Structures are given as C-alpha cells and as structure tokens.
Amino acid sequence: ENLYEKNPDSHGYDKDPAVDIWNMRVVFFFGFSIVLVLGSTFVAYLPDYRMQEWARREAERLVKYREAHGLPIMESNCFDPSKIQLPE
Amino acid sequence: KRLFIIKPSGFY
Amino acid sequence: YLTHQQKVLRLYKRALRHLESWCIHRDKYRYFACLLRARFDEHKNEKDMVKATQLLREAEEEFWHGQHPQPYIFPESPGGTSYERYECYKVPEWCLDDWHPSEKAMYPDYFAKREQWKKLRRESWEREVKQLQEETPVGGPRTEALPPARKQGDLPPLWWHIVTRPRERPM
Amino acid sequence: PKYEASRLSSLPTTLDPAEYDISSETRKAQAERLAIRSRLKREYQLQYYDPSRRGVIEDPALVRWTYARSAFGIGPLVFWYYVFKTDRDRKEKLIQEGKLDRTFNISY
Amino acid sequence: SGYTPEEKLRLQQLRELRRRWLKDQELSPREPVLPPNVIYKTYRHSIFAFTHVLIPVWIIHYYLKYHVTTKPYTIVEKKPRIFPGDTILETGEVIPPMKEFPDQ
Amino acid sequence: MLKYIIPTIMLMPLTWLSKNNMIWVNSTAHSLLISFTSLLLMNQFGDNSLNFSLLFFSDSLSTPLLILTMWLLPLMLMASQHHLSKENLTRKKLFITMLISLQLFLIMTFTAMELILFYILFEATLVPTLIIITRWGNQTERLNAGLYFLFYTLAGSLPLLVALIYIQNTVGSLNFLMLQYWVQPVHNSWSNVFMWLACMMAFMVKMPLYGLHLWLPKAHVEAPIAGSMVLAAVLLKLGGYGMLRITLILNPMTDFMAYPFIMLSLWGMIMTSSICLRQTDLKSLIAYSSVSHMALVIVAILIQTPWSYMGATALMIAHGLTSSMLFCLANSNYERIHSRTMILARGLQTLLPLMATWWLLASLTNLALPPTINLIGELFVVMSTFSWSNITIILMGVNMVITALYSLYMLIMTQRGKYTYHINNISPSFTRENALMSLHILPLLLLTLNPKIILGPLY
Amino acid sequence: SWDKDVYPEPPRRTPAPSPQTSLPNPITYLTKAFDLLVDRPVTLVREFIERQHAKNKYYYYHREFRRVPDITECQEKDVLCMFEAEMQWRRDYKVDQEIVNIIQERLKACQQREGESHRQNCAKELEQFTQVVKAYQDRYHDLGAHYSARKCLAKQKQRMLAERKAAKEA
Amino acid sequence: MNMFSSLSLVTLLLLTMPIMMMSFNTYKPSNYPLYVKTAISYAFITSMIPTMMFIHSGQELIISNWHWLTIQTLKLSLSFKMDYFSMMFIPVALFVTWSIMEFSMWYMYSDPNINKFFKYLLLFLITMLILVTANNLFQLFIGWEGVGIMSFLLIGWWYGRADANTAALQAILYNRIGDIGFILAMAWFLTNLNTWDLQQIFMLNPSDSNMPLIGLALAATGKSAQFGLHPWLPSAMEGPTPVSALLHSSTMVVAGIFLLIRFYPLTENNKYIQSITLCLGAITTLFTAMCALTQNDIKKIIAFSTSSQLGLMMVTIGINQPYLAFLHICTHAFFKAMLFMCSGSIIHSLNDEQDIRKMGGLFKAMPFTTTALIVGSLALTGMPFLTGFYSKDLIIEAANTSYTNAWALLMTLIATSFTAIYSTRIIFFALLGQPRFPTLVNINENNPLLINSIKRLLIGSLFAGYIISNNIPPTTIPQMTMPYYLKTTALIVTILGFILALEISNMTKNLKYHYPSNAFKFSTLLGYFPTIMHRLAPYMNLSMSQK
Amino acid sequence: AHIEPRYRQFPQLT
Ligand SMILES: CCCCCCCCCCCCO[C@@H]1O[C@H](CO)[C@@H](O[C@H]2O[C@H](CO)[C@@H](O)[C@H](O)[C@H]2O)[C@H](O)[C@H]1O
Ligand SMILES: CCCCCCCCCCCCO[C@@H]1O[C@H](CO)[C@@H](O[C@H]2O[C@H](CO)[C@@H](O)[C@H](O)[C@H]2O)[C@H](O)[C@H]1O
Ligand SMILES: CCCCCCCCCCCCO[C@@H]1O[C@H](CO)[C@@H](O[C@H]2O[C@H](CO)[C@@H](O)[C@H](O)[C@H]2O)[C@H](O)[C@H]1O
C-alpha cells in the first residue's frame, strides 16, 4: 500500500489527513521548537557546569597570592607531612 | 528543443 | 559458442585496434593495417579446418604477445573514461507517478501524452502475453530472441522498457 | 611467452585451448545452458514488463545466496597477550627504577 | 551474417515507438506552467561588499575588541623587531648603532 | 527522580484513555515533554553528585544516559507507528505500554544508589525487551535461543547476584556512595578471581564482549525497529554503565584480570570491523558495527584512566545516537523493499536525494569524522590506550582504517551506482521519516558545540 | 581587564615608523580607512550598550570555601568526616588543574611573543612550567579513574617512605 | 593588530557565508556558482591586507578566541596561527581557487547539480584553510580529515560509475593509513609533552622525537602520496577536471608537505627523520616521473607530474630546507592548476576525450590553450625566471651542496630530466602533428569564463615566483658559492631531457614496427603496484573476513 | 552559437 495514493499530501503519520497533520505539528513543535531550540539555549547558559569557571578564578587567586609571597605555586605534598605518621 | 527531464518527486 | 568465422573477424578487429594504439600516427597506422590485412588474405582460401584452427590459435598467441598494455578505449565504451558517467542522471519513468499534483500541474501537455502511452501499454499487455505463449514451444524458450508483432494493431511483445528507456543524455 | 594463470589473473579466453576444441557434446551443453538462461529470462520478463506489477521481483537465486551466507582462532590472542604483557612489564620496571622519562607526562 | 527477416521487422517496429516516445518528451511552448551599466555592476558589488565584508568585520571587530582581547593571552602578538638605530614609541628610547663595519 | 518516574507512568493512562486515532499523537507529544524536563538533571557539581534521596542519585555518568533514554521514547514511537498501523487498537496500546515500561525501568536503573536495586531493574528491562522482540519480531526464530538464555543466566545474572549478596555481607552495604568511602583493596586469591568474574561477566555479555557477541546480530535481525533502537542505543550501555560503577570495588585485581578481556576487545575490535565488509544484511552489518565500537568501551573501562573514562562516556552516547540512526535509515528502505539484503536496492541516491544526505551524515559520524563526538570519544580512548602500551596504536589505527572502509562501503552499495530496474515502488521519503532522521543527527552534531556535558564525571 | 600579575606581559616596544621611500604606505592608509569605517561605528555601538549597562548595576561574587579537616584527620570509615574531606580534595584537585593551565598559557604566550628568540627569552617560563608539572605529577598522577583523597594519601606516604629511606642510605 | 586580526578572520568567515546562505536566505539558485566565485574573489582581497602587513614588518599573531573544552590540564581552544606560512599560502590558494571556480562556471555548465558542485568546492577550500591556520593539533586534525572527506565526495562525483566509487574509496583507504601516523603524533605529544598546541611543542623541543616524527612522516606519506601510499592520486582522476585542478594544487595533496613544514623546529634537529624523508621523497620523485613517461591519458600524466613534484618537495624537507619546500608549494599551485585547466579545455573541445593518441594538431586550433600549456610546461620544467624557477632552481642548488645521501641526489636529478620528457610528451602529442580526433570539429575556446580564468593563472605562472621571492623575508642563509657544474646542473639536465625527448617522440613517426619492452610495460603499468597490491591486499582481507 | 562546427576542416577562429 501507498499512503500517497489516497492522500498525495500525506506526511506519513496517519491515513486520516486531519490526524496526519496534527501528528506532524506535535513532532515538529515539541521536537524542534521546544526540545532542540530551548534545550540548546538552556544548556548553553548552564550556571557554571561542574564548577570549571570557579576553579579558574580560584586558581588565579592562589597563583596571585603564592607568587606575591615567595611560596611555591604548587607543592609535591597534597597533605601536610606533620599530620602524617609513617609506619615503622 | 527543450526536453522533459525525468526526476524524482522533489516536492516532499 | 562462436563460429570459427566469427573468431577470426573478432581477432582481425581487435588486432587492428591494438595496432592503431601502437602506431598512433594515421599514416603509420594505415601502412601496417594493410600489412596486417595482407596476412589474413594470405589464408582466406584455406580449406583444411584443422590447419585453419591452428592458424587462428597461433594468431591469438601472437596477438597476446604483441598486445598493447594500454590500448585506446572509446570514452563511453566499457572501461573508458566516460563509461557510465550519466547513470546517476537516468531516472526511470515510473518515478513520475509519485510526483505531487502540483508538480504535474507544471507540465499538463507532457503528462496528458504520458497517460496515452500508459493506456496503450495496458490495452496491449494481454495480447503480448498470448503471442509469446502460442509461439513458445513446450519446455520454454530455446533462445532469448523475441518475435515481432504479427498483425496490424499489435505491438511487438515486451516493448515498454525498451521504448521508454532513459535517454543517453538525460540531463 | 606462454601465459601462466594465477588466482588473481585468469587465463585469457582466446588462449584457452578448450575454446577451440568443441565437439558436439560440448555444443549440446552450450545449448542446454542457453535454454536455462532463456527460460529464466522469460520468467523474469513476464514479471518485469507486467503493467500492473508494483513492487520487487523476488529472486530465489538472491534469497538462496543470502540464506547460505547468513547461516587462527585463539592464536592471535595469545600472541597479542605476550606482546603487550612483555611491553608493560618492561615499562613498569623502568618507572620503578626512574629510568623512564615522564617529565611532562600528567595526562593519562 | 546479417539480421534475419524477423529481427529486422522487430527492430523496425520498436524504432517507430521509440522515436515517437522521444518526440513526446519535448516540452510544449507554455511548459513549464509556473505559478505566479557600470552602476549596476557597482551596485551589485557595492551591496555585496556591504553585506559580505562590512557587516562581517563590524561583528568581528566588536567580538575581538570587546570580548576576546579583554581576556588574557587570547590574541598574542609576536613582538616587533627592533633594529639598531630605532626609536621606541612607548619610551622614546633610542637604540644605538652597531660598531663600525670593517671595510668590505 | 520522582518528577520523571511519575510522569512516565502517567503515559500509560494517557495511552489507554486517548481517542482511538490519537494514541500516536498523544504519547509522542507528552513523551517529548518528559524529554524536555530531563535537561534539569544537568545541575551537576564539580565535587558532589546530585543525590536526590536514599534510593536515587544522578551524576555526570548517568545524567547523559538518562537524557538519551528519555529522548529515545518519542523517536521509537515515531519509528514504530507505520508498520504497526495495520495492528489492531488493543495491540498498539500494549506495544506502546511495553515501551513506556521499558523507559520506566531504564531511568530507575541508571539512578539507583543500591547495587541490588540496580540488579533487579537491570534484569527487569529484559522482560519488556524480549516481549517486544518476540511478539512483534520478524520471524518465528527465538531471540532467547535457549543456549543464550542459559549461558547468560548461568555465567552472568546468577553469579552477579551472589557476588552482590556476598559483598553486602562483607562490607555491610551496597549503596554506591558508601562504597566510595568503605572500599577495600582486593587481594590475590582464587576466591577473589571468581568474585571478579562474577561481578563482570554479566556486563561483558550485555556490552557485548567479543566472543560473547553472536547473540546481538541475531537479535537485530529479528527485532522490530523500535527494538533495535533501544537495544543498540541504551540496552548495551547498561553493561557499560554497570562496569564503570562496579570497577570501583575491584581494584587492584583489575590490574591483571583485565588482560584477557583487553586482548579479546583489541583483537575482536579488528575482527568484527572486517566482518562488516562481508555482511549481506544491513541489520547484521550495523550489529557487527556495534560490537566493534563497544570493544573500545570495554578497553577504556578496563584500563581505567581519567581520559579513558571520559572517552568511554562520550563513546556510549555517540554510538547510541549513531547506531540508532543507522537502524532507522535501514528500516526506511526495508519498509519499501521488504528485504534486509544490502545489495538488493542500489543507486537509491537517484530516487531519494534527501534521504541520501541522512545516510552520508550517519556514515560520517560512524567512521568518527572530527569534530563529531564520535571522534572525541574514540580519540580519548586512543590517547589513553597509547599510554597503556604504545603498541596499541597499531591496532587502534588499523581499526580506524577498516571502520572507514565498511562505513563508506555501506553508503556506496546502497546509495550509489545504478538503481535496480525491477524495484518500482520506491515512494518519496515521508515527512515522518525525514523528521525521524533529523532528530537523531541534529542533537548529535549540536553536542560538538558543548561536549563537556557528555564527558562523564571524570571531566 | 584581567590581573596583570597572574598573566604577566612585558612592556611593549614598537619602533617608530622611519619611512625611506616616496611611495605612500598603503597599510597606513588602510589603517585610517579601518579606524573610520570599522572602529568608530563599532565604538559608538558599544558606548550605547555600556550606557544601558551603567543604569543597571548588579554584582556577582566568587564563592569562598572555608577549610575543613583533611582526609589525614578523618577516622577510618567515618563517612561524615571523610565526605567533607573528600569534597575538599576534589575542589583542590580541580583548582590545581587550572593552576597548571595558567602556567602553560604563560609558556605558550611567551613562545609566540619572543619569536625566534624564544629559546633564550622563555627560560624562566619553561623552568616554572617544569616545576609545577612536577608538583602536579607528584600529587595526582597514576591515581586512576577512581581517584580519591585516600589514594592520594597512599601515594604520598609511599613517596615519603622512599624519601625517608634514601636519607638513611645517604 | 586590531585591523590585522579582524581582516584575518573575516576571510575565513566570508568563505562560510555562502554555506550558511544555503538555508534559503535570499537564496538565488539562478546563479549560486557566480555567488561562490565572488565570495572567493573578495576573500582574496581581504586576505591580501594581512599579507601586506606581514610583508611590511613581519607582524604575526595567534588568535585563540573561543575556549572549547578543558580536559583537566589540557585546554582546547579555537586558535588560528596567522604566521609566515598562513600569510603567504592563503592568498595563493584563494587566487588559484578563484580561477578554478570561474573555469568551473563553464566546464560544469551542463551539470544538473552545478550548485551542489560549487558548494563542495567551497567546503573543500574551507577545510584546507582550517588546516593551514590551525594552531593546535586537534584543530589541525579537523581540517586534515575534512579535505579527505571532500576528496571522497568530489572524486566520486559521478556516482553511477563504479570506477568513480572505487577511486573515491581508494583515496580514503590510503589516507586513513596515513592518519595512523597523525594520531600517533597526537598520542605522543599529549603523553610525553602535555599539549596539542604547536607553541608548547616547540617550546619544549624534545630531542627524543623519532616516534612523533615518524608518525608525521607517515601522515604526510599518505596525504601527499609518497611512494608506498601513492596509487590513490592517479586514481583520483575519476573526478571532474575542476576537482583535479584543486586537488592537485591548492588543497589536499600539499597538506602532507605543509604538515612537515609546520614541524620544522623539530625536524631541524633530527638527522634520522631528515634521512628518511630525503630517501622517501627521492624514490617518489623518480618513480612517479618514470610512470608518467608512458601514460596516454592526459589527466594521468599531470597526476603523476604532481606526485613527482610532491616528491621533490619531500626531498626539500629532507635536506633541511623547509622554507624552500613552502616556496615550491606556492609556485607549483600556479602552473599546475593551469595545466589541468588547459587539459580540461582540450578534453571539452574533443568531446570528453582524454587520450593523447586521439589529439594532435591543436597548436593553431586552440591558440590560447596552446599558449597557456606551453607557459605552464616551461614553468614546470624550471625555465629561467618563470614561476617554477624561483623554487626548483634553488632546491636543486641546495640539494647539490648539502651533506646528503648520494643516491637520493642522483635520483632527484634524473627525475628533473624526466620532467622535461613527459612535459614534451604532452606538447608533442596534444598540440603538434596532424589531428587524430573525430571528424566533427567542435573546437571552441572562445568563452570569457575560460579565457579569463586561464589568463589570471597564466599571469601568475609568469610573475608570481618573482613577486613572492622578492617579498618574503630571509629565514635561512642561501648558499650561493658553488662550482659552475653544480650551479647549472638543474638547467643542463632539463635541457638534455628536452633533447632526449624529441628523439623519442620523432621515432614514433618512422614506419618501423615497435617491440614491447620490460621497461616500457613496467612504466605503462605503473610498476605493477596497483595490479598486485590492489588485487592481493583486498583479497587477503576480504577472504579473511568470511572465515 | 557564434562559432559553427565544421566537418573535416580547420575550425573557425576569432
Ligand atoms: C501541556 C500539555 C500539552 C499537550 C499538547 C498535546 C497537543 C495534541 C494536540 C492534538 C489535538 C487533536 O484534537 C482532536 O483532533 C481533531 C482532528 O483530528 C480536532 O477536530 C475535531 O474536533 C473538533 C472539536 O469538536 C471539531 O472541529 C471536530 O469534532 C473535529 O474537527 C480536534 O482538535 C480534536 O477532536
Ligand atoms: C532566551 C530567553 C530566556 C528567558 C529566561 C531568562 C531571562 C531572565 C532575565 C532576568 C535577569 C534578571 O537579573 C536580575 O537583574 C536585576 C537588575 O536590577 C538585579 O536586581 C538587583 O540588582 C541591583 C542590586 O542587587 C539593583 O539594581 C536592583 O534593585 C536589584 O533588585 C538582580 O540581582 C538580577 O538577578
Ligand atoms: C557571523 C554573522 C554573519 C552575519 C551575516 C548577516 C547576513 C548579511 C547578508 C544579507 C544579504 C545576503 O545575500 C545573499 O548573498 C548574495 C548577495 O548579493 C546574493 O547573491 C546575489 O549576488 C550574486 C553575485 O554577487 C549572484 O550570483 C546572485 O544571483 C545574486 O542573487 C544571494 O542570493 C543572497 O542570498
């Protein structure tokens, strides 16, 4: 069978032309106008996803502070050896 | 002479 | 499959075309084309078909040795540079059926003439099927040849896809 | 000069001796083959040219082919295991002896 | 070695139809039925320069001047070459000459 | 997660209470709204995950998988309705109800805190899946061929259940947040070897691992289009998602227990790509294509480095959208010619010009053309496995060559060359089909602009 | 715009134009054509926008994270204290990734800026990049995809044991 | 820097505008090809303003405008390196593309998909400018694979022809083998360094650079079709003639050479990689030149001419003269693109005949095509002071006086002589003699699109080398002191090639019966590399798959 | 066509 024989304007959704035109509109409005257009906008303006932009501001703060005080920009030890009690 | 060019339906 | 008479003529044609590929220049080619023709003429009136077959076999061995690595090929022949270049432009006629009515509204004279052909195809099909069945021996065809229309008003059986085949330069 | 056919280089039909020594049993087989091809051609053409047929001319020969088709081993695995296992053992040893250069390597 | 009498007749009958079919691919005079000097070259070029050069550079300059260059190290120049005898614009400094070359 | 569970359940009353001719309109519209609200899950943090309650949580791993799961329901409904149009009304609603219930189990599976809760749902997804594949499948052949059900349950589901039950006794909990702080190293021990295999074999079969993969091509050849979409896009990622989680508690035994599975994946990555060159069935070709791509994900998970986990997450999402689109493209041809043979209909670009553009885009993402997230994921796994061992670049590179070969071979065979003469029922592409393809590819390409939201928690 | 100390750049020295040809310099003329057709209309548009911005003045802040006890002070299997120390370690790990990024950006900016003299004139940038990369590698390299404060501490103590042992050997 | 950078990006942005307008923005499909040509022409003008500023004071920039992604300690940004190589290559490529697009406005006139053809050429150009301006390896990879796909889509333009689909897929196969080397470099640079940026790579300047540089040499081997991964470039003649003109000049094939030029700060200090690329180039330059001697298809000859000149470029890389390798890319694009446009002019007149044995007697029949072909041929063969002489002549002088592989040098000089032989072969068989083409004469080169497009490249093939070589700044110390017999070596072997080719061509006229030779069949059949490799390698792989 | 094709003859030039 061919949906185009009965309805040369068929969108391929339904045999009834009225339902076939409603089913197109919803797929196109909620699929492209809402999810893909507003979803892309929403994602494009996410408030600092996973804190990456805060980390850069914090790193600038620390680099500025550590260079103005002669401290190393970064130390090998992540934890203070004073609070570590080695075995043996 | 201008001839007809058989093509697939471009409307859809 | 072929006769002896056909194998020689196919080797004469193929020999000439490769000789033309070697010579390039028309005067040089015309000189050796008559030398080659003379070689065939030397054995035109042989009667011992055992000798005649051995002559052909040695000729084909000679051809394969003297064959040209890059013979000239007509651009549109199989293996040529234009072979099948326009296949991407050949659209079968049945695709016009699926056109939207607004697309068919642009060519009202063409599509009116196209229903005349489709009508002709319908009214002819039953007669074509009979003619093949009545003329066809028991056990099916022995060959691929097809007959002509026998009466006035009939169309030769199985003609649509030959007649309505895409033009060789569709676009 | 004699031609030597290979798997990827067939013997030319004009040099094949079988193509000149045809008897009447060979000619009868050639007719039997043209009859089959002709019967199949007619069967296809009566469907191909039918004005009212819209669809696909189902081909049993194509079905039989894809049916049969759709219906070394560990060795390379053992080989690759020793290639990688050996490499990563040599690399692991060098890192513990500080002999491997990773001066700027901080992505992994 | 030529056509058999039936082969010629079938060929002739298919010639009539094939030639008639090709004649029918010709378009009617009305078909397709469609639904409803320096200045010119300058205007076409002038309007092209405006839409495809001036507007793009307005957007690009705005983007670079106010959004890119205001972030560090986004546009990094190679420092200009200073040759002896130059005058530095920023400071007014004067680069000395080179030693006197030996004769050559 | 109740703001997604409850509306998903409400798709069942909606489907059964709609007018007879509105079932497709109603369910597609509302399932697209649920997909819209799923973007609120991207409220992720650099340090902590989004821990909703004692049962469910979301982090950067599950969040993209949840969004993909919720996106796929409307797409499956659009893809299914043409061939189910001759089905009677009560059976259309049951078919839709199976899809809704499958989404309900999937969103709960991806967010469960407790690994036993994950196990029950991870298995409950098979009940709707087998029903869809068998009840609406092509032939009388059994997808659960008996051998496969036995092998999987004996060597997969059951050992995983006992291992999880054993772990909770020893640790006192299977909550994943607790397992992050109370994890203890796994020492060498014949008993521990069996705990390792028990914790992993179930997910290896579902991925599938090379050598345990023969079930997947068989399932695709039998499934309806919706079945193939969910199976390729999500259900394989259940095994990948499970491994990414459970490997937390398997160290350092994974240091050596992973070698056979890396070897199977690295070699099977090339063997399955080569098989794709001699496939006569589109659905089989795409199925073997998935085995090749999922071989990278197994390798990435098993070498467990930050780059391989980022690459694994990107690969799972990119493959989900690409393999799903490839199955939809193949299905559209099938709905005209009624055959899965790839050689039957050729030169289709002549007859369906726009659909040939969808084919090209689907093939370019499949062969990992930069900068598509298909490549971003694949490149990251290649970068990480080079560190694991430089020799791997040879196998990774060769697979890249072969992948380009069968991707364009599939495009060339079906779209280019001369068209088949006797196939005269190729009707123009429907708006439904064109929209179905564009809803696969547009989000896939848009993610190239913001890849970070698909890179997982390691980002 | 940014902080000059964090992203330093040396003073710019551009030599004065010293033409020695009667031909007009087409670049200087194109510069005026640019400064008139492009810069000024662009500046007018921006100044109007910045006028609207000045009317509406609101502020955003850089989040400050008070310090909490590290993993070294947490009791074994005490998730409440391990949780806060674990989150703090992840925040520091993310910050350290961006400290290394700042130092790399200095190194790359230096190389381009110095042109053909970069090998000599970017030795300070290269040395700083070397030490920071070394310190970052010491902290976080080889932890695995399932890294944590606990595994970072185990790596450190192993390194501290090797340092302590080689002291005796000395 | 405000004007330099703004005009640097508008050139890239401008080329993409016809692509964006394809979404039916005032779309005028009446003359989309004209719209595309105009955008290229205006893109050429705007690109020449940054070039003048660089010529003036050597000004150069990096524009890292958009931060795309950060992977822990690897920040990825959209960064454009607008330096020496970008400054000079972009105007040349835009100038050449402008002529090829105007030529295509006539050559492809009857193609129903004319608009789609021009869109593909524009994308094919865009992905090349992404490649050249790229400042990090990832963005370089986007362009690197970008040209590869457009090569596939344009080589396989006539997609009903199985030979076209086979050549399109062959280009992809050989190029993705080279891309194994590209990812190997990316993997090595990320691991051993911590960057894909060229700046941090050069700043760290590793000495243990064998592995990343073997990866780049392999990547250049496939993309620029050096020996081993070379058969695809001749096969690429299946595409329309305008495609071959772009492919063989201002886009794909030079990307492999361009990549190695980018990394000259590394190849400088690696005598091992210099020795590999010298020998790799030397066999390529000779082997492909030898193949061109016996070819009869006019497009095949020019296609092998490219492989032979790309081989010479690879030699220049291997004698540590990267800036002469670049100068040859620029000059070669002029006369090589013209030769393809002259072949297409002949092919079109003779109704799609590409076999020189069916040409002849065209010297007067096509006067302007003849003039351009002779100028193009002389420029290719290093006639003094034409565009090709300013690069080829210095390259042979620099190769002669270097501490070099002796065998590579001899193979490079013989390939120079062969260049004069197959160039003569085209002139003799296409233009001289009596006509050998069919009897219905449709020779007509009177079209302004054809005349103007070829004329602009003809002017470039005369003065482009002189103008460029007088404006670029010195980056090396050219070695100008040397014996007479080394100074004049390039001219001498070129002249003996011309003399040695006249005798061979004239003997074709004697009424003597040839005799095939082992050397002749070896050259005609391309050394049998396609016949063996393209049958055996697919057989082993495809038969391996089923079982 | 401002240039007429010829048969077996040298083409018309401008
Ligand atoms: C926030 C939630 C948003 C959910 C949005 C869902 C949108 C779905 C829209 C589908 C609307 C279809 O609604 C149904 O369809 C038919 C056409 O077949 C329409 O038309 C029919 O009903 C109306 C009302 O009697 C009459 O014109 C007539 O009976 C008939 O034409 C009506 O609209 C309705 O009977
Ligand atoms: C793509 C379309 C998407 C549409 C939805 C998103 C758009 C929403 C835009 C609303 C933005 C409002 O942002 C808001 O601006 C006003 C400006 O006075 C600020 O208001 C506040 O700022 C300062 C002091 O704090 C004062 O000027 C003001 O009296 C005070 O109320 C808010 O602190 C800020 O949060
Ligand atoms: C990054 C942001 C960029 C912002 C760009 C904003 C858009 C500005 C462009 C508006 C006008 C575009 O106009 C678009 O291009 C040219 C303009 O002459 C038109 O093309 C026109 O000129 C060309 C030659 O010059 C002719 O071949 C063509 O027949 C004619 O129609 C296109 O048919 C039209 O679609």
d(CA F74, CA G80): 42
H203 close to D (CB below 8 A): no
Measuring from atom 19 of ligand 1, which residue has the nearest CA? Answer: A18
Kindly state the helix (H) or strand (E) to which residue H546 belongs, with its residue range.
Answer: helix H529-546
Among the partner-chain residues E48, E65, E74, the one whose CB lies closest to the CB of H2 is E65
Which tokens go with G10?
Answer: 């040396």
- Cβ-defined contact of A4 to C98 (cutoff 8 Å): yes
Our CA dihedral for F207, F400, F458, F123, rounded to 10 degrees, sits at -10
Determine the distance separating the centroid of ligand 2 and the alpha carbon of G56, expressed in angstroms: 9
Q: Give DSSP secondary structure letters for F3-67.
A: HHHHHHHHHHHHHHHS-GGGHHHHHHHHHHHHHHHGGGGG---SSS-EE-SSSBEE-TTHHHHHH
Exposure string for G76-85, b = 16+ CB within 10 A, e = fewer: eeeeebbbeb
- Residue H480 has phi, psi (to 5 degrees) of -110, -5
Determine the distance separating the centroid of ligand 1 and the alpha carbon of F333, expressed in angstroms: 32
Report CA torsion sign: F153, F154, F160, F163.
Answer: positive
Residue in H14, H8, H11 with CA at minimum distance from that of residue H64: H8
Which tokens go with G153?
Answer: 């501490």
Q: Give DSSP secondary structure letters for H304-370.
A: HHHHHHHHHHHHHHHTT-HHHHHHHHHHHHHHHHHHHHHHHHHHHHTTS--BGGG----TTTSHHHH
d(CA F397, CA H181): 8
Which tokens go with A43?
Answer: 């994602």
Q: Is residue C150 helix, strand or coil?
A: coil
Ligand nearest to the CA of F34: 1
- Cβ-defined contact of G134 to A76 (cutoff 8 Å): yes
User: Is F224 within 8 Å of F133 (Cβ atoms)?
Assistant: yes
Ligand 1-lining residues (CB < 6 angstroms): A 18-19, 22, 26; F 25, 29
d(CA F444, CA F322): 8
Ligand 2-lining residues (CB < 6 angstroms): A 41; G 56-58
Residue H326 burial by Cβ neighbours in a 10 Å radius (0-12, 13-18, 19+): buried
- C-alpha pair distances (Å), H35 with each of F1, F30, F347, H29, H101: 53, 45, 31, 9, 10
Mutation to test the E interface, candidates H10, H64, H199, most E Cβ within 10 Å = H10
Residues preceding chain discontinuities in chain C with C to N over 2.5 Å: none
User: Is C63 within 8 Å of C11 (Cβ atoms)?
Assistant: yes
The length of chain D is 108
Which tokens go with C138?
Answer: 């028991």
394-453 in F: which are within 8 Å (CB) of C? 416-419, 421, 424, 426-428
Determine the distance separating the centroid of ligand 3 and the alpha carbon of H86, expressed in angstroms: 27
Determine the distance separating the centroid of ligand 1 and the alpha carbon of F93, expressed in angstroms: 20
Q: Is residue C8 helix, strand or coil?
A: helix
Residue in the structure block whose two tokens are 């002088």: H397
- C-alpha pair distances (Å), H208 with each of G111, G122, G134, H214, H216: 21, 21, 19, 11, 14
**Termini Cα distance of chain D:** 61
d(CA F262, CA D77): 10
d(CA F213, CA F198): 18
Residue in F142, F140, F162 with CA at minimum distance from that of residue F153: F162
Residues 6+ apart with CB under 8 A from F20: F89
- F238 residue type, one letter: L
Residues 6+ apart with CB under 8 A from F272: F210, F213, F288, F289, F291, F292, F295
Measuring from atom 25 of ligand 2, which residue has the nearest CA? Answer: G58
Kindly state the helix (H) or strand (E) to which residue H109 belongs, with its residue range.
Answer: none
Q: Give DSSP secondary structure letters for H445-498.
A: ---HHHHHHHHHHHHHHHHHHHHHHTTSPP-S-------HHHHTHHHHHHHHHH
Residues 6+ apart with CB under 8 A from D24: none
Among the partner-chain residues A52, A73, A83, the one whose CB lies closest to the CB of G103 is A73
User: Is F430 within 8 Å of A12 (Cβ atoms)?
Assistant: yes
d(CA G53, CA G56): 5
Among the partner-chain residues H74, H535, H536, the one whose CB lies closest to the CB of D107 is H74
Other C-beta atoms closer than 10 Å to the C-beta of F40 total 11
- Residue D81 has phi, psi (to 5 degrees) of -60, -45
- C-alpha pair distances (Å), F212 with each of E22, F5, F33: 60, 33, 38
Residue in F283, F232, F273, F324 with CA at minimum distance from that of residue H176: F273
Chain B residues touching residue F430 (CB < 8 angstroms): 12
Ligand nearest to the CA of H23: 3
Residue of G nearest to E71 (CA): G2
d(CA F300, CA F311): 7
Q: Give DSSP secondary structure letters for C52-114.
A: HHHHHHHHHHHHHHH--SS----TTSTTSTTTTTTGGG---GGGGGGS-HHHHTT-HHHHHHH
Closest ligand 2 atom, CA of A41?
1
Determine the distance separating the centroid of ligand 3 and the alpha carbon of G91, expressed in angstroms: 50
Other C-beta atoms closer than 10 Å to the C-beta of C138 total 4
Residues 6+ apart with CB under 8 A from F128: F98, F99, F101, F102, F105
